[PDB]
PDB file of N, CA and C in Angstrom:
ATOM      1  N   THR A   1     173.325 215.426  44.666  1.00  0.00           N
ATOM      2  CA  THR A   1     174.024 214.848  43.519  1.00  0.00           C
ATOM      3  C   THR A   1     175.121 215.785  43.018  1.00  0.00           C
ATOM      4  N   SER A   2     176.360 215.285  42.984  1.00  0.00           N
ATOM      5  CA  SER A   2     177.483 216.118  42.564  1.00  0.00           C
ATOM      6  C   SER A   2     177.262 216.684  41.168  1.00  0.00           C
ATOM      7  N   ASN A   3     176.666 215.896  40.274  1.00  0.00           N
ATOM      8  CA  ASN A   3     176.332 216.423  38.956  1.00  0.00           C
ATOM      9  C   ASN A   3     175.242 217.488  39.065  1.00  0.00           C
ATOM     10  N   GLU A   4     174.295 217.298  39.987  1.00  0.00           N
ATOM     11  CA  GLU A   4     173.225 218.272  40.179  1.00  0.00           C
ATOM     12  C   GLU A   4     173.779 219.591  40.700  1.00  0.00           C
ATOM     13  N   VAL A   5     174.603 219.523  41.749  1.00  0.00           N
ATOM     14  CA  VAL A   5     175.264 220.714  42.275  1.00  0.00           C
ATOM     15  C   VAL A   5     176.090 221.391  41.190  1.00  0.00           C
ATOM     16  N   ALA A   6     176.891 220.607  40.468  1.00  0.00           N
ATOM     17  CA  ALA A   6     177.755 221.170  39.439  1.00  0.00           C
ATOM     18  C   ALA A   6     176.938 221.862  38.355  1.00  0.00           C
ATOM     19  N   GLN A   7     175.890 221.193  37.866  1.00  0.00           N
ATOM     20  CA  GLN A   7     174.994 221.815  36.896  1.00  0.00           C
ATOM     21  C   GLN A   7     174.434 223.124  37.430  1.00  0.00           C
ATOM     22  N   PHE A   8     173.979 223.114  38.684  1.00  0.00           N
ATOM     23  CA  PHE A   8     173.371 224.299  39.283  1.00  0.00           C
ATOM     24  C   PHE A   8     174.350 225.465  39.318  1.00  0.00           C
ATOM     25  N   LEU A   9     175.572 225.221  39.790  1.00  0.00           N
ATOM     26  CA  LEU A   9     176.565 226.282  39.896  1.00  0.00           C
ATOM     27  C   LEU A   9     177.223 226.643  38.564  1.00  0.00           C
ATOM     28  N   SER A  10     177.002 225.860  37.506  1.00  0.00           N
ATOM     29  CA  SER A  10     177.586 226.151  36.197  1.00  0.00           C
ATOM     30  C   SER A  10     176.868 227.274  35.461  1.00  0.00           C
ATOM     31  N   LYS A  11     175.641 227.594  35.858  1.00  0.00           N
ATOM     32  CA  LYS A  11     174.860 228.604  35.165  1.00  0.00           C
ATOM     33  C   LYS A  11     175.420 229.990  35.460  1.00  0.00           C
ATOM     34  N   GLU A  12     175.787 230.712  34.410  1.00  0.00           N
ATOM     35  CA  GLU A  12     176.449 231.992  34.582  1.00  0.00           C
ATOM     36  C   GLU A  12     175.435 233.124  34.649  1.00  0.00           C
ATOM     37  N   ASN A  13     175.844 234.220  35.285  1.00  0.00           N
ATOM     38  CA  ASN A  13     175.070 235.463  35.283  1.00  0.00           C
ATOM     39  C   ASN A  13     173.714 235.297  35.969  1.00  0.00           C
ATOM     40  N   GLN A  14     173.686 234.512  37.037  1.00  0.00           N
ATOM     41  CA  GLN A  14     172.471 234.268  37.799  1.00  0.00           C
ATOM     42  C   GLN A  14     172.508 235.004  39.130  1.00  0.00           C
ATOM     43  N   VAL A  15     171.319 235.347  39.625  1.00  0.00           N
ATOM     44  CA  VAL A  15     171.115 235.742  41.014  1.00  0.00           C
ATOM     45  C   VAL A  15     170.621 234.513  41.755  1.00  0.00           C
ATOM     46  N   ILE A  16     171.245 234.202  42.886  1.00  0.00           N
ATOM     47  CA  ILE A  16     170.854 233.040  43.673  1.00  0.00           C
ATOM     48  C   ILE A  16     170.030 233.515  44.853  1.00  0.00           C
ATOM     49  N   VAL A  17     168.886 232.875  45.070  1.00  0.00           N
ATOM     50  CA  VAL A  17     168.052 233.153  46.227  1.00  0.00           C
ATOM     51  C   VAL A  17     168.025 231.913  47.108  1.00  0.00           C
ATOM     52  N   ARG A  18     168.243 232.113  48.404  1.00  0.00           N
ATOM     53  CA  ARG A  18     168.146 231.044  49.383  1.00  0.00           C
ATOM     54  C   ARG A  18     166.748 231.036  50.000  1.00  0.00           C
ATOM     55  N   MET A  19     166.152 229.852  50.078  1.00  0.00           N
ATOM     56  CA  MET A  19     164.857 229.621  50.709  1.00  0.00           C
ATOM     57  C   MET A  19     165.142 228.965  52.052  1.00  0.00           C
ATOM     58  N   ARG A  20     164.480 229.423  53.106  1.00  0.00           N
ATOM     59  CA  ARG A  20     164.613 228.794  54.416  1.00  0.00           C
ATOM     60  C   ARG A  20     163.227 228.486  54.940  1.00  0.00           C
ATOM     61  N   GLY A  21     163.096 227.375  55.657  1.00  0.00           N
ATOM     62  CA  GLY A  21     161.825 227.052  56.277  1.00  0.00           C
ATOM     63  C   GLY A  21     160.893 226.206  55.438  1.00  0.00           C
ATOM     64  N   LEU A  22     161.393 225.580  54.379  1.00  0.00           N
ATOM     65  CA  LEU A  22     160.513 224.806  53.505  1.00  0.00           C
ATOM     66  C   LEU A  22     159.904 223.628  54.257  1.00  0.00           C
ATOM     67  N   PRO A  23     158.643 223.295  53.990  1.00  0.00           N
ATOM     68  CA  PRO A  23     158.144 221.962  54.336  1.00  0.00           C
ATOM     69  C   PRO A  23     159.144 220.902  53.898  1.00  0.00           C
ATOM     70  N   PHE A  24     159.341 219.897  54.750  1.00  0.00           N
ATOM     71  CA  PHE A  24     160.260 218.827  54.395  1.00  0.00           C
ATOM     72  C   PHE A  24     159.781 218.064  53.168  1.00  0.00           C
ATOM     73  N   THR A  25     158.478 218.087  52.898  1.00  0.00           N
ATOM     74  CA  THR A  25     157.884 217.465  51.719  1.00  0.00           C
ATOM     75  C   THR A  25     157.892 218.354  50.481  1.00  0.00           C
ATOM     76  N   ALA A  26     158.453 219.562  50.557  1.00  0.00           N
ATOM     77  CA  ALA A  26     158.394 220.478  49.421  1.00  0.00           C
ATOM     78  C   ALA A  26     159.036 219.864  48.181  1.00  0.00           C
ATOM     79  N   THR A  27     158.382 220.062  47.044  1.00  0.00           N
ATOM     80  CA  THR A  27     158.836 219.554  45.760  1.00  0.00           C
ATOM     81  C   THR A  27     159.245 220.692  44.836  1.00  0.00           C
ATOM     82  N   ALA A  28     160.030 220.343  43.816  1.00  0.00           N
ATOM     83  CA  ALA A  28     160.409 221.345  42.829  1.00  0.00           C
ATOM     84  C   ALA A  28     159.181 221.993  42.194  1.00  0.00           C
ATOM     85  N   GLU A  29     158.128 221.210  41.940  1.00  0.00           N
ATOM     86  CA  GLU A  29     156.909 221.777  41.359  1.00  0.00           C
ATOM     87  C   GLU A  29     156.273 222.808  42.284  1.00  0.00           C
ATOM     88  N   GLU A  30     156.264 222.532  43.589  1.00  0.00           N
ATOM     89  CA  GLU A  30     155.709 223.499  44.533  1.00  0.00           C
ATOM     90  C   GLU A  30     156.558 224.758  44.615  1.00  0.00           C
ATOM     91  N   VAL A  31     157.882 224.633  44.499  1.00  0.00           N
ATOM     92  CA  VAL A  31     158.738 225.819  44.510  1.00  0.00           C
ATOM     93  C   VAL A  31     158.517 226.668  43.258  1.00  0.00           C
ATOM     94  N   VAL A  32     158.448 226.016  42.096  1.00  0.00           N
ATOM     95  CA  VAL A  32     158.081 226.722  40.868  1.00  0.00           C
ATOM     96  C   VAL A  32     156.773 227.478  41.067  1.00  0.00           C
ATOM     97  N   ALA A  33     155.775 226.806  41.649  1.00  0.00           N
ATOM     98  CA  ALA A  33     154.476 227.434  41.851  1.00  0.00           C
ATOM     99  C   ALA A  33     154.571 228.613  42.810  1.00  0.00           C
ATOM    100  N   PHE A  34     155.367 228.465  43.875  1.00  0.00           N
ATOM    101  CA  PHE A  34     155.545 229.521  44.870  1.00  0.00           C
ATOM    102  C   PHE A  34     156.031 230.802  44.216  1.00  0.00           C
ATOM    103  N   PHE A  35     157.018 230.685  43.324  1.00  0.00           N
ATOM    104  CA  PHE A  35     157.515 231.898  42.682  1.00  0.00           C
ATOM    105  C   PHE A  35     156.625 232.361  41.533  1.00  0.00           C
ATOM    106  N   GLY A  36     156.012 231.442  40.809  1.00  0.00           N
ATOM    107  CA  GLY A  36     155.083 231.832  39.768  1.00  0.00           C
ATOM    108  C   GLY A  36     155.773 232.360  38.526  1.00  0.00           C
ATOM    109  N   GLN A  37     154.944 232.767  37.563  1.00  0.00           N
ATOM    110  CA  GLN A  37     155.458 233.182  36.262  1.00  0.00           C
ATOM    111  C   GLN A  37     156.140 234.544  36.282  1.00  0.00           C
ATOM    112  N   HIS A  38     155.925 235.360  37.313  1.00  0.00           N
ATOM    113  CA  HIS A  38     156.636 236.631  37.423  1.00  0.00           C
ATOM    114  C   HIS A  38     158.028 236.489  38.031  1.00  0.00           C
ATOM    115  N   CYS A  39     158.393 235.299  38.495  1.00  0.00           N
ATOM    116  CA  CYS A  39     159.754 234.999  38.929  1.00  0.00           C
ATOM    117  C   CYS A  39     160.123 233.658  38.332  1.00  0.00           C
ATOM    118  N   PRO A  40     160.350 233.585  37.022  1.00  0.00           N
ATOM    119  CA  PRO A  40     160.692 232.289  36.430  1.00  0.00           C
ATOM    120  C   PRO A  40     162.088 231.862  36.850  1.00  0.00           C
ATOM    121  N   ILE A  41     162.209 230.611  37.244  1.00  0.00           N
ATOM    122  CA  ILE A  41     163.485 230.036  37.661  1.00  0.00           C
ATOM    123  C   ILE A  41     164.244 229.573  36.429  1.00  0.00           C
ATOM    124  N   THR A  42     165.533 229.881  36.394  1.00  0.00           N
ATOM    125  CA  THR A  42     166.365 229.482  35.263  1.00  0.00           C
ATOM    126  C   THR A  42     166.399 227.975  35.132  1.00  0.00           C
ATOM    127  N   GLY A  43     165.898 227.467  34.009  1.00  0.00           N
ATOM    128  CA  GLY A  43     165.831 226.030  33.850  1.00  0.00           C
ATOM    129  C   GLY A  43     164.632 225.374  34.492  1.00  0.00           C
ATOM    130  N   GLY A  44     163.682 226.156  34.996  1.00  0.00           N
ATOM    131  CA  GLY A  44     162.518 225.576  35.642  1.00  0.00           C
ATOM    132  C   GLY A  44     162.947 224.781  36.858  1.00  0.00           C
ATOM    133  N   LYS A  45     162.430 223.559  36.971  1.00  0.00           N
ATOM    134  CA  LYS A  45     162.813 222.710  38.091  1.00  0.00           C
ATOM    135  C   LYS A  45     164.315 222.447  38.154  1.00  0.00           C
ATOM    136  N   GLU A  46     165.041 222.553  37.038  1.00  0.00           N
ATOM    137  CA  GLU A  46     166.479 222.335  37.127  1.00  0.00           C
ATOM    138  C   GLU A  46     167.215 223.474  37.817  1.00  0.00           C
ATOM    139  N   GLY A  47     166.586 224.630  37.999  1.00  0.00           N
ATOM    140  CA  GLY A  47     167.281 225.703  38.675  1.00  0.00           C
ATOM    141  C   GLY A  47     167.017 225.720  40.167  1.00  0.00           C
ATOM    142  N   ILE A  48     166.570 224.592  40.720  1.00  0.00           N
ATOM    143  CA  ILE A  48     166.280 224.447  42.148  1.00  0.00           C
ATOM    144  C   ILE A  48     167.227 223.412  42.732  1.00  0.00           C
ATOM    145  N   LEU A  49     167.990 223.808  43.750  1.00  0.00           N
ATOM    146  CA  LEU A  49     168.883 222.909  44.475  1.00  0.00           C
ATOM    147  C   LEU A  49     168.354 222.747  45.890  1.00  0.00           C
ATOM    148  N   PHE A  50     167.758 221.600  46.176  1.00  0.00           N
ATOM    149  CA  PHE A  50     167.331 221.308  47.534  1.00  0.00           C
ATOM    150  C   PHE A  50     168.540 220.859  48.343  1.00  0.00           C
ATOM    151  N   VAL A  51     168.740 221.464  49.504  1.00  0.00           N
ATOM    152  CA  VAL A  51     169.843 221.049  50.368  1.00  0.00           C
ATOM    153  C   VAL A  51     169.390 219.814  51.136  1.00  0.00           C
ATOM    154  N   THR A  52     170.153 218.726  51.030  1.00  0.00           N
ATOM    155  CA  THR A  52     169.793 217.480  51.691  1.00  0.00           C
ATOM    156  C   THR A  52     170.985 216.940  52.468  1.00  0.00           C
ATOM    157  N   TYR A  53     170.671 216.091  53.441  1.00  0.00           N
ATOM    158  CA  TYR A  53     171.671 215.300  54.140  1.00  0.00           C
ATOM    159  C   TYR A  53     172.207 214.218  53.202  1.00  0.00           C
ATOM    160  N   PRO A  54     173.271 213.514  53.594  1.00  0.00           N
ATOM    161  CA  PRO A  54     173.864 212.530  52.675  1.00  0.00           C
ATOM    162  C   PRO A  54     172.924 211.413  52.281  1.00  0.00           C
ATOM    163  N   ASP A  55     171.904 211.117  53.086  1.00  0.00           N
ATOM    164  CA  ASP A  55     170.902 210.110  52.772  1.00  0.00           C
ATOM    165  C   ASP A  55     169.696 210.685  52.046  1.00  0.00           C
ATOM    166  N   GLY A  56     169.763 211.942  51.620  1.00  0.00           N
ATOM    167  CA  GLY A  56     168.651 212.552  50.928  1.00  0.00           C
ATOM    168  C   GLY A  56     167.589 213.153  51.815  1.00  0.00           C
ATOM    169  N   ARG A  57     167.740 213.083  53.134  1.00  0.00           N
ATOM    170  CA  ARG A  57     166.744 213.684  54.003  1.00  0.00           C
ATOM    171  C   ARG A  57     166.742 215.200  53.818  1.00  0.00           C
ATOM    172  N   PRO A  58     165.578 215.833  53.841  1.00  0.00           N
ATOM    173  CA  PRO A  58     165.520 217.274  53.582  1.00  0.00           C
ATOM    174  C   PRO A  58     166.019 218.072  54.774  1.00  0.00           C
ATOM    175  N   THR A  59     166.433 219.306  54.484  1.00  0.00           N
ATOM    176  CA  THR A  59     166.887 220.229  55.512  1.00  0.00           C
ATOM    177  C   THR A  59     165.931 221.377  55.769  1.00  0.00           C
ATOM    178  N   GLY A  60     165.008 221.654  54.848  1.00  0.00           N
ATOM    179  CA  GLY A  60     164.232 222.872  54.869  1.00  0.00           C
ATOM    180  C   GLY A  60     164.813 223.983  54.025  1.00  0.00           C
ATOM    181  N   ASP A  61     165.990 223.781  53.457  1.00  0.00           N
ATOM    182  CA  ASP A  61     166.699 224.822  52.736  1.00  0.00           C
ATOM    183  C   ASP A  61     166.720 224.482  51.251  1.00  0.00           C
ATOM    184  N   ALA A  62     166.738 225.515  50.410  1.00  0.00           N
ATOM    185  CA  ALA A  62     166.960 225.338  48.983  1.00  0.00           C
ATOM    186  C   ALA A  62     167.544 226.618  48.408  1.00  0.00           C
ATOM    187  N   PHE A  63     168.190 226.479  47.249  1.00  0.00           N
ATOM    188  CA  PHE A  63     168.656 227.618  46.471  1.00  0.00           C
ATOM    189  C   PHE A  63     167.994 227.603  45.100  1.00  0.00           C
ATOM    190  N   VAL A  64     167.691 228.791  44.560  1.00  0.00           N
ATOM    191  CA  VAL A  64     167.094 228.898  43.227  1.00  0.00           C
ATOM    192  C   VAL A  64     167.824 229.957  42.416  1.00  0.00           C
ATOM    193  N   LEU A  65     167.790 229.777  41.098  1.00  0.00           N
ATOM    194  CA  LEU A  65     168.462 230.647  40.141  1.00  0.00           C
ATOM    195  C   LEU A  65     167.463 231.560  39.442  1.00  0.00           C
ATOM    196  N   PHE A  66     167.751 232.860  39.454  1.00  0.00           N
ATOM    197  CA  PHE A  66     167.006 233.853  38.692  1.00  0.00           C
ATOM    198  C   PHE A  66     167.950 234.538  37.716  1.00  0.00           C
ATOM    199  N   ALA A  67     167.525 234.639  36.460  1.00  0.00           N
ATOM    200  CA  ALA A  67     168.395 235.183  35.428  1.00  0.00           C
ATOM    201  C   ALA A  67     168.422 236.703  35.417  1.00  0.00           C
ATOM    202  N   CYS A  68     167.419 237.354  35.989  1.00  0.00           N
ATOM    203  CA  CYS A  68     167.271 238.795  35.889  1.00  0.00           C
ATOM    204  C   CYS A  68     167.042 239.385  37.268  1.00  0.00           C
ATOM    205  N   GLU A  69     167.611 240.571  37.487  1.00  0.00           N
ATOM    206  CA  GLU A  69     167.464 241.246  38.771  1.00  0.00           C
ATOM    207  C   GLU A  69     166.000 241.531  39.090  1.00  0.00           C
ATOM    208  N   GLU A  70     165.200 241.887  38.076  1.00  0.00           N
ATOM    209  CA  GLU A  70     163.772 242.091  38.299  1.00  0.00           C
ATOM    210  C   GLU A  70     163.127 240.851  38.897  1.00  0.00           C
ATOM    211  N   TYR A  71     163.519 239.666  38.411  1.00  0.00           N
ATOM    212  CA  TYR A  71     162.986 238.429  38.972  1.00  0.00           C
ATOM    213  C   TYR A  71     163.365 238.302  40.438  1.00  0.00           C
ATOM    214  N   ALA A  72     164.619 238.614  40.764  1.00  0.00           N
ATOM    215  CA  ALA A  72     165.057 238.495  42.152  1.00  0.00           C
ATOM    216  C   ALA A  72     164.309 239.466  43.052  1.00  0.00           C
ATOM    217  N   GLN A  73     164.067 240.695  42.580  1.00  0.00           N
ATOM    218  CA  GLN A  73     163.284 241.652  43.361  1.00  0.00           C
ATOM    219  C   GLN A  73     161.865 241.140  43.593  1.00  0.00           C
ATOM    220  N   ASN A  74     161.215 240.665  42.523  1.00  0.00           N
ATOM    221  CA  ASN A  74     159.889 240.083  42.676  1.00  0.00           C
ATOM    222  C   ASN A  74     159.916 238.937  43.680  1.00  0.00           C
ATOM    223  N   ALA A  75     160.945 238.086  43.592  1.00  0.00           N
ATOM    224  CA  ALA A  75     161.052 236.920  44.459  1.00  0.00           C
ATOM    225  C   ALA A  75     161.242 237.334  45.908  1.00  0.00           C
ATOM    226  N   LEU A  76     162.089 238.330  46.151  1.00  0.00           N
ATOM    227  CA  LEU A  76     162.358 238.738  47.521  1.00  0.00           C
ATOM    228  C   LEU A  76     161.134 239.380  48.143  1.00  0.00           C
ATOM    229  N   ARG A  77     160.271 239.983  47.319  1.00  0.00           N
ATOM    230  CA  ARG A  77     159.011 240.485  47.857  1.00  0.00           C
ATOM    231  C   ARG A  77     158.099 239.381  48.381  1.00  0.00           C
ATOM    232  N   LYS A  78     158.372 238.116  48.073  1.00  0.00           N
ATOM    233  CA  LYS A  78     157.588 237.007  48.602  1.00  0.00           C
ATOM    234  C   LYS A  78     158.140 236.479  49.919  1.00  0.00           C
ATOM    235  N   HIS A  79     159.064 237.209  50.535  1.00  0.00           N
ATOM    236  CA  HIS A  79     159.592 236.815  51.833  1.00  0.00           C
ATOM    237  C   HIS A  79     158.453 236.655  52.832  1.00  0.00           C
ATOM    238  N   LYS A  80     158.397 235.478  53.455  1.00  0.00           N
ATOM    239  CA  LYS A  80     157.413 235.074  54.454  1.00  0.00           C
ATOM    240  C   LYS A  80     156.044 234.756  53.862  1.00  0.00           C
ATOM    241  N   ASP A  81     155.924 234.690  52.539  1.00  0.00           N
ATOM    242  CA  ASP A  81     154.777 234.015  51.947  1.00  0.00           C
ATOM    243  C   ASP A  81     154.787 232.540  52.332  1.00  0.00           C
ATOM    244  N   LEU A  82     153.628 231.899  52.220  1.00  0.00           N
ATOM    245  CA  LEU A  82     153.519 230.505  52.612  1.00  0.00           C
ATOM    246  C   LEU A  82     153.782 229.579  51.439  1.00  0.00           C
ATOM    247  N   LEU A  83     154.477 228.484  51.723  1.00  0.00           N
ATOM    248  CA  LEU A  83     154.510 227.300  50.875  1.00  0.00           C
ATOM    249  C   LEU A  83     153.960 226.185  51.747  1.00  0.00           C
ATOM    250  N   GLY A  84     152.813 225.644  51.365  1.00  0.00           N
ATOM    251  CA  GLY A  84     152.131 224.747  52.279  1.00  0.00           C
ATOM    252  C   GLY A  84     151.753 225.498  53.535  1.00  0.00           C
ATOM    253  N   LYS A  85     152.048 224.891  54.681  1.00  0.00           N
ATOM    254  CA  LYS A  85     151.696 225.472  55.968  1.00  0.00           C
ATOM    255  C   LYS A  85     152.729 226.462  56.493  1.00  0.00           C
ATOM    256  N   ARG A  86     153.902 226.566  55.873  1.00  0.00           N
ATOM    257  CA  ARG A  86     155.035 227.242  56.491  1.00  0.00           C
ATOM    258  C   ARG A  86     155.363 228.528  55.750  1.00  0.00           C
ATOM    259  N   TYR A  87     155.736 229.564  56.504  1.00  0.00           N
ATOM    260  CA  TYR A  87     156.239 230.780  55.883  1.00  0.00           C
ATOM    261  C   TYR A  87     157.700 230.579  55.478  1.00  0.00           C
ATOM    262  N   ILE A  88     158.035 231.085  54.300  1.00  0.00           N
ATOM    263  CA  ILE A  88     159.328 230.848  53.663  1.00  0.00           C
ATOM    264  C   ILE A  88     160.150 232.121  53.793  1.00  0.00           C
ATOM    265  N   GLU A  89     161.330 232.019  54.407  1.00  0.00           N
ATOM    266  CA  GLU A  89     162.231 233.158  54.461  1.00  0.00           C
ATOM    267  C   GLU A  89     163.127 233.128  53.232  1.00  0.00           C
ATOM    268  N   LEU A  90     163.292 234.286  52.598  1.00  0.00           N
ATOM    269  CA  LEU A  90     164.032 234.400  51.349  1.00  0.00           C
ATOM    270  C   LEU A  90     165.181 235.377  51.513  1.00  0.00           C
ATOM    271  N   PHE A  91     166.356 234.987  51.029  1.00  0.00           N
ATOM    272  CA  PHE A  91     167.555 235.808  51.139  1.00  0.00           C
ATOM    273  C   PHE A  91     168.349 235.709  49.854  1.00  0.00           C
ATOM    274  N   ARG A  92     169.022 236.798  49.499  1.00  0.00           N
ATOM    275  CA  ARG A  92     169.987 236.689  48.420  1.00  0.00           C
ATOM    276  C   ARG A  92     171.169 235.855  48.878  1.00  0.00           C
ATOM    277  N   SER A  93     171.782 235.146  47.934  1.00  0.00           N
ATOM    278  CA  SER A  93     172.949 234.336  48.269  1.00  0.00           C
ATOM    279  C   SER A  93     173.979 234.478  47.154  1.00  0.00           C
ATOM    280  N   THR A  94     175.002 233.634  47.211  1.00  0.00           N
ATOM    281  CA  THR A  94     176.086 233.641  46.233  1.00  0.00           C
ATOM    282  C   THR A  94     176.550 232.209  46.040  1.00  0.00           C
ATOM    283  N   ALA A  95     177.265 231.979  44.937  1.00  0.00           N
ATOM    284  CA  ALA A  95     177.814 230.651  44.680  1.00  0.00           C
ATOM    285  C   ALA A  95     178.733 230.210  45.814  1.00  0.00           C
ATOM    286  N   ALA A  96     179.534 231.138  46.347  1.00  0.00           N
ATOM    287  CA  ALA A  96     180.453 230.795  47.430  1.00  0.00           C
ATOM    288  C   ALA A  96     179.693 230.342  48.672  1.00  0.00           C
ATOM    289  N   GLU A  97     178.618 231.055  49.009  1.00  0.00           N
ATOM    290  CA  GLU A  97     177.793 230.648  50.136  1.00  0.00           C
ATOM    291  C   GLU A  97     177.068 229.340  49.863  1.00  0.00           C
ATOM    292  N   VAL A  98     176.588 229.125  48.635  1.00  0.00           N
ATOM    293  CA  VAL A  98     175.993 227.828  48.324  1.00  0.00           C
ATOM    294  C   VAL A  98     176.985 226.719  48.643  1.00  0.00           C
ATOM    295  N   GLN A  99     178.236 226.898  48.219  1.00  0.00           N
ATOM    296  CA  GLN A  99     179.277 225.908  48.500  1.00  0.00           C
ATOM    297  C   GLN A  99     179.462 225.692  50.006  1.00  0.00           C
ATOM    298  N   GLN A 100     179.548 226.778  50.778  1.00  0.00           N
ATOM    299  CA  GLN A 100     179.723 226.618  52.229  1.00  0.00           C
ATOM    300  C   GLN A 100     178.537 225.895  52.868  1.00  0.00           C
ATOM    301  N   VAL A 101     177.317 226.238  52.448  1.00  0.00           N
ATOM    302  CA  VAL A 101     176.142 225.585  53.013  1.00  0.00           C
ATOM    303  C   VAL A 101     176.136 224.104  52.647  1.00  0.00           C
ATOM    304  N   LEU A 102     176.345 223.786  51.370  1.00  0.00           N
ATOM    305  CA  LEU A 102     176.366 222.383  50.977  1.00  0.00           C
ATOM    306  C   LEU A 102     177.420 221.613  51.756  1.00  0.00           C
ATOM    307  N   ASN A 103     178.580 222.234  51.979  1.00  0.00           N
ATOM    308  CA  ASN A 103     179.651 221.589  52.732  1.00  0.00           C
ATOM    309  C   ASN A 103     179.223 221.277  54.149  1.00  0.00           C
ATOM    310  N   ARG A 104     178.313 222.082  54.703  1.00  0.00           N
ATOM    311  CA  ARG A 104     177.802 221.808  56.045  1.00  0.00           C
ATOM    312  C   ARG A 104     177.124 220.435  56.134  1.00  0.00           C
ATOM    313  N   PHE A 105     176.550 219.952  55.030  1.00  0.00           N
ATOM    314  CA  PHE A 105     175.754 218.731  55.033  1.00  0.00           C
ATOM    315  C   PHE A 105     176.408 217.537  54.352  1.00  0.00           C
ATOM    316  N   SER A 106     177.536 217.705  53.687  1.00  0.00           N
ATOM    317  CA  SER A 106     178.155 216.581  53.007  1.00  0.00           C
ATOM    318  C   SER A 106     179.358 216.068  53.793  1.00  0.00           C
ATOM    319  N   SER A 107     179.695 214.795  53.573  1.00  0.00           N
ATOM    320  CA  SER A 107     180.837 214.231  54.289  1.00  0.00           C
ATOM    321  C   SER A 107     182.148 214.862  53.829  1.00  0.00           C
ATOM    322  N   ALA A 108     182.313 215.068  52.509  1.00  0.00           N
ATOM    323  CA  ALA A 108     183.505 215.691  51.940  1.00  0.00           C
ATOM    324  C   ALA A 108     183.161 217.043  51.321  1.00  0.00           C
ATOM    325  N   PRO A 109     184.079 218.010  51.375  1.00  0.00           N
ATOM    326  CA  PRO A 109     183.792 219.327  50.787  1.00  0.00           C
ATOM    327  C   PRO A 109     183.615 219.258  49.274  1.00  0.00           C
ATOM    328  N   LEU A 110     182.820 220.194  48.757  1.00  0.00           N
ATOM    329  CA  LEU A 110     182.637 220.342  47.321  1.00  0.00           C
ATOM    330  C   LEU A 110     183.938 220.763  46.649  1.00  0.00           C
ATOM    331  N   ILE A 111     184.214 220.179  45.484  1.00  0.00           N
ATOM    332  CA  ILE A 111     185.323 220.642  44.651  1.00  0.00           C
ATOM    333  C   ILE A 111     184.765 221.135  43.320  1.00  0.00           C
ATOM    334  N   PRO A 112     184.745 222.448  43.098  1.00  0.00           N
ATOM    335  CA  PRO A 112     184.229 222.980  41.829  1.00  0.00           C
ATOM    336  C   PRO A 112     185.096 222.547  40.660  1.00  0.00           C
ATOM    337  N   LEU A 113     184.444 222.223  39.545  1.00  0.00           N
ATOM    338  CA  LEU A 113     185.161 221.874  38.318  1.00  0.00           C
ATOM    339  C   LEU A 113     184.632 222.662  37.121  1.00  0.00           C
TER     340      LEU A 113
END
């Protein structure tokens, strides 16, 4: 959702973490649970951007917002922890990379506003 992407990238002073390898059935609630209260996501479920194909099919990828560097460190320590049956690879990212990744899956490129 263009409004969803825009809302996600509008949050200032965030650290972005990329999730790779998610169960295709992964939900925002499960991602919140994966990080737990020691890595609170900015906006809760609203700080989670699932990367999807144009028809909404999942990719296995997501981005999440952390407001504090301590949260990002805690989060990165969960690299290869399980969500469901699958180990989750975690990487730091940036707004520019979020844009490039989203562009990989959309018919038209993102235009930031």
